[PDB]
Short mmCIF file of all heavy atoms in Angstrom, two decimals:
data_model
loop_
_atom_site.label_atom_id
_atom_site.label_comp_id
_atom_site.label_asym_id
_atom_site.label_seq_id
_atom_site.Cartn_x
_atom_site.Cartn_y
_atom_site.Cartn_z
N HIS A 1 -17.57 -5.17 13.91
CA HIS A 1 -16.58 -6.10 13.27
C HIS A 1 -16.46 -5.63 11.77
O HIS A 1 -15.44 -5.63 11.18
CB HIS A 1 -17.07 -7.52 13.36
CG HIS A 1 -16.05 -8.49 12.83
ND1 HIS A 1 -14.81 -8.68 13.33
CD2 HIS A 1 -16.15 -9.32 11.75
CE1 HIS A 1 -14.12 -9.63 12.66
NE2 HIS A 1 -14.97 -10.07 11.63
N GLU A 2 -17.67 -5.47 11.15
CA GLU A 2 -17.62 -5.11 9.74
C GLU A 2 -17.10 -3.69 9.56
O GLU A 2 -16.34 -3.49 8.61
CB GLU A 2 -18.96 -5.32 9.12
CG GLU A 2 -19.49 -6.79 9.22
CD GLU A 2 -20.95 -6.98 9.09
OE1 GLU A 2 -21.61 -5.97 8.57
OE2 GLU A 2 -21.44 -8.05 9.37
N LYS A 3 -17.55 -2.74 10.43
CA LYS A 3 -17.09 -1.40 10.25
C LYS A 3 -15.54 -1.30 10.34
O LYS A 3 -14.94 -0.45 9.55
CB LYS A 3 -17.75 -0.50 11.35
CG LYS A 3 -17.63 0.89 11.07
CD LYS A 3 -18.75 1.30 10.02
CE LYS A 3 -18.45 2.44 9.17
NZ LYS A 3 -18.36 3.81 9.87
N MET A 4 -14.89 -2.10 11.04
CA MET A 4 -13.47 -2.07 11.21
C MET A 4 -12.84 -2.58 9.93
O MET A 4 -11.68 -2.08 9.56
CB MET A 4 -12.99 -3.03 12.38
CG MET A 4 -13.40 -2.49 13.73
SD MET A 4 -12.85 -0.68 13.89
CE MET A 4 -14.41 0.29 13.67
N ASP A 5 -13.49 -3.47 9.26
CA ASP A 5 -12.92 -3.94 7.93
C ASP A 5 -12.95 -2.82 6.93
O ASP A 5 -12.03 -2.62 6.17
CB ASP A 5 -13.73 -5.15 7.40
CG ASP A 5 -13.05 -6.47 7.76
OD1 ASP A 5 -11.87 -6.47 8.22
OD2 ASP A 5 -13.69 -7.49 7.57
N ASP A 6 -13.93 -1.92 7.09
CA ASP A 6 -14.07 -0.73 6.24
C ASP A 6 -13.00 0.26 6.57
O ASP A 6 -12.38 0.84 5.60
CB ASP A 6 -15.49 -0.13 6.33
CG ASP A 6 -16.63 -1.11 5.76
OD1 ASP A 6 -16.32 -2.08 4.98
OD2 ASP A 6 -17.79 -0.92 6.19
N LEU A 7 -12.69 0.55 7.84
CA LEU A 7 -11.70 1.39 8.30
C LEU A 7 -10.31 0.89 7.84
O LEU A 7 -9.48 1.68 7.50
CB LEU A 7 -11.80 1.54 9.82
CG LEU A 7 -12.24 2.95 10.32
CD1 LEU A 7 -13.53 3.33 9.64
CD2 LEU A 7 -12.50 2.69 11.78
N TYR A 8 -10.16 -0.35 7.94
CA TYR A 8 -8.91 -0.93 7.63
C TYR A 8 -8.63 -0.69 6.15
O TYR A 8 -7.48 -0.29 5.80
CB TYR A 8 -8.99 -2.43 7.81
CG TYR A 8 -7.65 -3.15 7.62
CD1 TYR A 8 -6.67 -3.25 8.60
CD2 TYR A 8 -7.23 -3.54 6.30
CE1 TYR A 8 -5.42 -3.82 8.42
CE2 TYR A 8 -5.94 -4.09 6.14
CZ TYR A 8 -4.99 -4.20 7.19
OH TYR A 8 -3.84 -4.79 7.04
N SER A 9 -9.54 -0.90 5.28
CA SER A 9 -9.32 -0.63 3.93
C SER A 9 -9.10 0.89 3.56
O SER A 9 -8.33 1.30 2.81
CB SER A 9 -10.52 -1.12 3.02
OG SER A 9 -10.59 -2.51 3.25
N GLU A 10 -9.87 1.70 4.25
CA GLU A 10 -9.78 3.05 4.00
C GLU A 10 -8.43 3.65 4.39
O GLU A 10 -7.70 4.30 3.63
CB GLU A 10 -10.92 3.83 4.70
CG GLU A 10 -10.71 5.26 4.62
CD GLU A 10 -11.82 6.25 5.15
OE1 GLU A 10 -12.75 5.71 5.83
OE2 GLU A 10 -11.85 7.43 4.82
N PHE A 11 -7.98 3.37 5.65
CA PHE A 11 -6.82 3.97 6.05
C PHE A 11 -5.58 3.37 5.29
O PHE A 11 -4.55 4.06 5.01
CB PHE A 11 -6.72 4.01 7.60
CG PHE A 11 -7.69 5.11 8.08
CD1 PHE A 11 -9.01 4.76 8.35
CD2 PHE A 11 -7.27 6.41 8.12
CE1 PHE A 11 -9.88 5.81 8.78
CE2 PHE A 11 -8.06 7.41 8.54
CZ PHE A 11 -9.44 7.11 8.96
N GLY A 12 -5.79 2.12 4.92
CA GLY A 12 -4.74 1.39 4.09
C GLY A 12 -4.58 2.13 2.80
O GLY A 12 -3.48 2.30 2.36
N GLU A 13 -5.70 2.61 2.26
CA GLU A 13 -5.58 3.39 1.08
C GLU A 13 -4.80 4.76 1.30
O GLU A 13 -4.07 5.27 0.52
CB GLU A 13 -6.77 3.60 0.22
CG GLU A 13 -7.44 2.40 -0.41
CD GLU A 13 -8.70 2.73 -1.16
OE1 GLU A 13 -9.21 3.90 -1.12
OE2 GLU A 13 -9.40 1.80 -1.77
N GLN A 14 -5.25 5.44 2.38
CA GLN A 14 -4.72 6.74 2.76
C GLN A 14 -3.17 6.53 2.85
O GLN A 14 -2.37 7.38 2.28
CB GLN A 14 -5.08 7.33 4.09
CG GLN A 14 -6.42 7.91 4.08
CD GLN A 14 -6.73 8.76 5.37
OE1 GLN A 14 -5.73 8.99 6.09
NE2 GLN A 14 -7.95 9.17 5.58
N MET A 15 -2.87 5.47 3.49
CA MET A 15 -1.51 5.20 3.62
C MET A 15 -0.70 4.99 2.32
O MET A 15 0.30 5.68 2.07
CB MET A 15 -1.40 3.79 4.43
CG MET A 15 -0.09 3.59 5.03
SD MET A 15 1.02 2.83 3.92
CE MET A 15 0.43 1.15 4.05
N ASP A 16 -1.27 4.22 1.37
CA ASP A 16 -0.56 4.07 0.08
C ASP A 16 -0.45 5.35 -0.63
O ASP A 16 0.62 5.69 -1.22
CB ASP A 16 -1.18 2.99 -0.73
CG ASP A 16 -0.26 2.44 -1.95
OD1 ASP A 16 0.89 1.94 -1.57
OD2 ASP A 16 -0.64 2.42 -3.07
N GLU A 17 -1.55 6.13 -0.55
CA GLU A 17 -1.59 7.45 -1.24
C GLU A 17 -0.58 8.51 -0.70
O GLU A 17 0.06 9.28 -1.33
CB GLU A 17 -3.00 8.11 -1.21
CG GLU A 17 -4.03 7.45 -2.07
CD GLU A 17 -5.34 8.22 -2.06
OE1 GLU A 17 -5.31 9.50 -1.99
OE2 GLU A 17 -6.46 7.60 -2.06
N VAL A 18 -0.40 8.48 0.64
CA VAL A 18 0.45 9.47 1.26
C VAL A 18 1.82 8.97 0.72
O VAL A 18 2.64 9.71 0.33
CB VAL A 18 0.32 9.17 2.74
CG1 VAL A 18 1.48 9.82 3.53
CG2 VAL A 18 -0.98 9.87 3.22
N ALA A 19 2.06 7.66 0.79
CA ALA A 19 3.40 7.20 0.50
C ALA A 19 3.72 7.60 -0.89
O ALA A 19 4.71 8.01 -1.36
CB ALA A 19 3.58 5.73 0.79
N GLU A 20 2.67 7.29 -1.79
CA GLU A 20 2.99 7.57 -3.21
C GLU A 20 3.19 9.09 -3.44
O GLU A 20 3.89 9.46 -4.38
CB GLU A 20 2.09 6.79 -4.15
CG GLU A 20 2.18 5.21 -3.96
CD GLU A 20 1.24 4.44 -4.83
OE1 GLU A 20 0.33 4.94 -5.50
OE2 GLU A 20 1.41 3.18 -4.75
N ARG A 21 2.45 9.91 -2.73
CA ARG A 21 2.62 11.36 -2.95
C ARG A 21 3.96 11.72 -2.53
O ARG A 21 4.69 12.53 -3.22
CB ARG A 21 1.51 12.11 -2.15
CG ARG A 21 1.71 13.62 -2.22
CD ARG A 21 1.73 14.12 -3.62
NE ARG A 21 1.96 15.59 -3.64
CZ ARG A 21 2.33 16.18 -4.73
NH1 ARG A 21 2.36 15.69 -5.95
NH2 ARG A 21 2.55 17.58 -4.73
N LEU A 22 4.49 11.02 -1.43
CA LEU A 22 5.86 11.41 -0.96
C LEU A 22 6.82 11.04 -2.08
O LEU A 22 7.73 11.84 -2.46
CB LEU A 22 6.20 10.55 0.22
CG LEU A 22 7.61 10.64 0.80
CD1 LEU A 22 7.99 12.09 1.13
CD2 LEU A 22 7.64 9.90 2.09
N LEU A 23 6.69 9.89 -2.58
CA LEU A 23 7.50 9.44 -3.62
C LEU A 23 7.53 10.36 -4.78
O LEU A 23 8.50 10.78 -5.37
CB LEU A 23 6.87 8.12 -4.04
CG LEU A 23 7.62 6.80 -4.24
CD1 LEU A 23 8.84 6.66 -3.44
CD2 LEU A 23 6.58 5.78 -3.88
N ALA A 24 6.27 10.94 -5.11
CA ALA A 24 6.12 11.78 -6.24
C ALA A 24 6.80 13.14 -6.02
O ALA A 24 7.14 13.80 -7.00
CB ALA A 24 4.75 11.98 -6.53
N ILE A 25 6.91 13.54 -4.77
CA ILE A 25 7.57 14.89 -4.49
C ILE A 25 9.07 14.69 -4.29
O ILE A 25 9.71 15.59 -3.80
CB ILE A 25 6.97 15.65 -3.41
CG1 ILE A 25 7.09 14.98 -2.00
CG2 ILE A 25 5.50 16.15 -3.84
CD1 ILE A 25 6.44 15.68 -0.91
N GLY A 26 9.60 13.53 -4.68
CA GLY A 26 10.97 13.22 -4.52
C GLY A 26 11.40 12.63 -3.17
O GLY A 26 12.55 12.50 -2.85
N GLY A 27 10.45 12.21 -2.29
CA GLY A 27 10.77 11.65 -1.02
C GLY A 27 11.00 10.07 -1.07
O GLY A 27 10.89 9.44 -2.15
N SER A 28 11.25 9.48 0.14
CA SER A 28 11.43 8.09 0.21
C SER A 28 10.73 7.59 1.52
O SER A 28 11.14 7.71 2.62
CB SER A 28 12.94 7.80 0.37
OG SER A 28 13.59 8.19 -0.78
N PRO A 29 9.59 6.93 1.31
CA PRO A 29 8.78 6.48 2.48
C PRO A 29 9.48 5.38 3.29
O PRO A 29 10.10 4.53 2.80
CB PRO A 29 7.50 5.93 1.88
CG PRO A 29 8.10 5.39 0.43
CD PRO A 29 9.04 6.42 0.03
N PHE A 30 9.16 5.43 4.55
CA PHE A 30 9.62 4.39 5.53
C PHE A 30 8.95 3.19 4.95
O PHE A 30 7.84 3.20 4.43
CB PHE A 30 9.11 4.56 6.83
CG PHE A 30 9.66 5.83 7.56
CD1 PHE A 30 8.76 6.74 8.20
CD2 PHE A 30 10.95 6.10 7.62
CE1 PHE A 30 9.19 7.86 8.84
CE2 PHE A 30 11.46 7.22 8.31
CZ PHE A 30 10.57 8.13 8.89
N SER A 31 9.50 1.98 5.16
CA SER A 31 8.94 0.82 4.60
C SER A 31 9.29 -0.44 5.36
O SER A 31 9.60 -1.39 4.64
CB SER A 31 9.28 0.76 3.15
OG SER A 31 10.66 0.70 2.96
N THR A 32 9.36 -0.47 6.66
CA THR A 32 9.65 -1.54 7.47
C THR A 32 8.91 -1.26 8.84
O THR A 32 8.65 -0.12 9.07
CB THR A 32 11.09 -1.67 7.82
OG1 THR A 32 11.52 -0.41 8.49
CG2 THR A 32 11.97 -1.90 6.59
N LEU A 33 8.51 -2.32 9.46
CA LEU A 33 7.79 -2.13 10.78
C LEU A 33 8.73 -1.33 11.71
O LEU A 33 8.34 -0.60 12.52
CB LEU A 33 7.42 -3.41 11.51
CG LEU A 33 6.24 -4.23 10.84
CD1 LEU A 33 6.67 -4.52 9.45
CD2 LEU A 33 5.90 -5.52 11.56
N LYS A 34 10.01 -1.80 11.54
CA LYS A 34 10.97 -1.08 12.49
C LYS A 34 10.93 0.40 12.22
O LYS A 34 10.70 1.12 13.22
CB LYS A 34 12.35 -1.60 12.29
CG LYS A 34 13.39 -0.97 13.14
CD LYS A 34 14.68 -1.80 13.08
CE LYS A 34 15.84 -1.08 13.91
NZ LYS A 34 16.29 0.17 13.22
N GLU A 35 10.98 0.87 10.99
CA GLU A 35 10.86 2.23 10.78
C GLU A 35 9.57 2.85 11.23
O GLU A 35 9.52 4.03 11.81
CB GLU A 35 10.99 2.65 9.35
CG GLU A 35 12.47 2.41 8.89
CD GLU A 35 12.50 2.52 7.41
OE1 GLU A 35 12.05 1.58 6.67
OE2 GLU A 35 13.18 3.49 6.82
N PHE A 36 8.50 2.11 11.06
CA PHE A 36 7.18 2.60 11.49
C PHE A 36 7.18 2.85 12.94
O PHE A 36 6.73 3.92 13.41
CB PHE A 36 6.04 1.72 11.01
CG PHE A 36 5.99 1.47 9.52
CD1 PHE A 36 5.44 0.30 9.08
CD2 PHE A 36 6.47 2.37 8.61
CE1 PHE A 36 5.33 0.00 7.72
CE2 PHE A 36 6.32 2.13 7.29
CZ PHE A 36 5.85 0.91 6.81
N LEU A 37 7.61 1.81 13.71
CA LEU A 37 7.64 1.92 15.16
C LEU A 37 8.51 3.04 15.65
O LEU A 37 8.14 3.79 16.60
CB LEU A 37 8.23 0.60 15.75
CG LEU A 37 7.10 -0.39 15.87
CD1 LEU A 37 7.50 -1.68 16.41
CD2 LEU A 37 6.19 0.39 16.77
N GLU A 38 9.63 3.19 14.90
CA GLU A 38 10.48 4.31 15.39
C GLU A 38 9.90 5.76 15.10
O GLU A 38 10.27 6.59 15.81
CB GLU A 38 11.94 4.16 14.61
CG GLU A 38 12.60 2.91 14.98
CD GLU A 38 13.90 2.71 14.35
OE1 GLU A 38 14.16 3.37 13.30
OE2 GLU A 38 14.70 1.94 14.80
N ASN A 39 9.08 5.87 14.02
CA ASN A 39 8.60 7.19 13.77
C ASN A 39 7.24 7.53 14.10
O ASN A 39 6.88 8.68 14.10
CB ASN A 39 8.98 7.54 12.34
CG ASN A 39 10.46 7.37 12.08
OD1 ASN A 39 10.93 6.28 11.83
ND2 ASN A 39 11.15 8.47 12.04
N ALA A 40 6.41 6.53 14.54
CA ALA A 40 5.02 6.89 14.72
C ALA A 40 4.69 7.67 15.97
O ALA A 40 5.24 7.47 17.04
CB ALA A 40 4.21 5.55 14.75
#
């Protein structure tokens, strides 16, 4: 139960970082559950 809390935080940060790197390279991240569901 605690390990999952750790994974949750970690991947959450990977997520923000990927998104922000996209933004930095001139991209536009998906940003709705609908989009997420559509592309995952």
Side-chain angles (χ1 to χ4, degrees):
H1 182 66
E2 301 162 11
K3 198 76 205 297
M4 293 307 103
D5 268 343
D6 298 338
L7 248 50
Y8 184 87
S9 301
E10 171 174 14
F11 288 91
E13 292 177 355
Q14 275 195 15
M15 200 278 281
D16 199 57
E17 292 184 40
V18 164
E20 299 175 353
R21 173 54 185 168
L22 178 52
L23 225 33
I25 66 183
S28 296
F30 295 129
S31 61
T32 59
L33 287 60
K34 181 167 176 289
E35 292 168 290
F36 303 148
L37 273 183
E38 300 178 341
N39 307 77

